[PDB]
């Protein structure tokens, strides 16, 4: 099975006249074996366009953001979702945003509903008087299996 969500922020966060604005990728998971892939463009991958981009959490996908009160808090994903396994590598590179892409697959059984987030934020980059956009991933997990 090659079921896969892809949040590709490459052409979503480039500086434009209306920027900065929020680009949201909503990931709805209520089936087993769903793979999630998030592409966050690297600083310097293209000249000027991502000079001040930023990804949160740095330890994604092992660490994610979750909403406590109004405050986003970093939490271990393996704590929120028991039985989660993360591939150490993705296409022979470290599974970390520092390589430009992260991936993870949720386990075949999830008992508790959970929502967590990633951030790929280019709103602090300026080029030709235009500002980049702020990207956000929301993973919505419903119990399944």
């Amino acid at each position: 099975t090659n079921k896969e969500y892809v949040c590709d922020f490459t052409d979503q966060l480039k500086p434009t006249e209306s920027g900065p604005k929020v680009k949201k990728c909503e990931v709805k998971v209520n089936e087993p074996l769903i793979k999630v892939k998030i592409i966050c463009p690297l600083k310097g991958s293209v000249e000027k366009l991502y000079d001040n981009i930023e990804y949160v959490p740095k330890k994604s996908p092992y660490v994610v953001l979750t909403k406590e009160e109004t405050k986003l808090k970093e939490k271990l994903l393996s704590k929120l979702i028991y039985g989660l396994l993360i591939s150490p590598t993705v296409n022979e590179k470290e599974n970390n945003f520092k390589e430009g892409v992260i991936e993870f697959t949720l386990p075949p059984v999830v008992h508790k509903a959970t929502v967590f987030y990633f951030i790929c934020d280019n709103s602090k980059t300026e080029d030709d008087n235009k500002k980049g956009n702020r990207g956000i991933v929301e993973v919505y997990v419903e119990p399944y299996g």
Partner: nanobody, 124 residues
Framework: QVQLQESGGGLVQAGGSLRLSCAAS????????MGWFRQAPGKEREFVAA????????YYADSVKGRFTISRDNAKNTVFLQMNSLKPEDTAVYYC?????????????????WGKGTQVTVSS
């Protein structure tokens, strides 16, 4: 490979309902996130709705959310688009599509197969 064929289009009155269907050939239907797109007169083609591999999750364009609903029958290789409270602005050619990967921020990006479309005309 996979071929998609839409059916169910026709003339409807404003305020009515119409259900579209889309059949897929082969034996890999559940490998595909399925979706509906449309092209209205004088416009570019736009996203309408999508339904996940198992049928468990659905996405809807803001222009139709609440009025249209999508579902699938993996035992019959069919996707359905239920339209309620049809408006003249819903007149369009409706296109079926599918792909193994789904791009929520840009739903056309992951589509690898496309039907030929079926016309829906809403008169008032």
């Amino acid at each position: 490979q996979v071929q998609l064929q839409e059916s169910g289009g026709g003339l409807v009155q404003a305020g009515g309902s119409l259900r579209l269907s889309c059949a897929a050939s082969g034996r890999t239907f559940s490998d595909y996130f399925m979706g509906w797109f449309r092209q209205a007169p004088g416009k570019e083609r736009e996203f309408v709705a999508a339904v996940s591999w198992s049928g468990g999750s659905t996405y809807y364009a803001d222009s139709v959310k609440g009025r249209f609903t999508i579902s699938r029958d993996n035992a019959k290789n069919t996707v359905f688009l239920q339209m309620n409270s049809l408006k003249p602005e819903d007149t369009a050619v409706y296109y079926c599509a599918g792909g193994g990967s789904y791009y929520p921020m840009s739903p056309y990006d992951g589509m690898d197969y496309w039907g030929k479309g079926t016309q829906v005309t809403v008169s008032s």
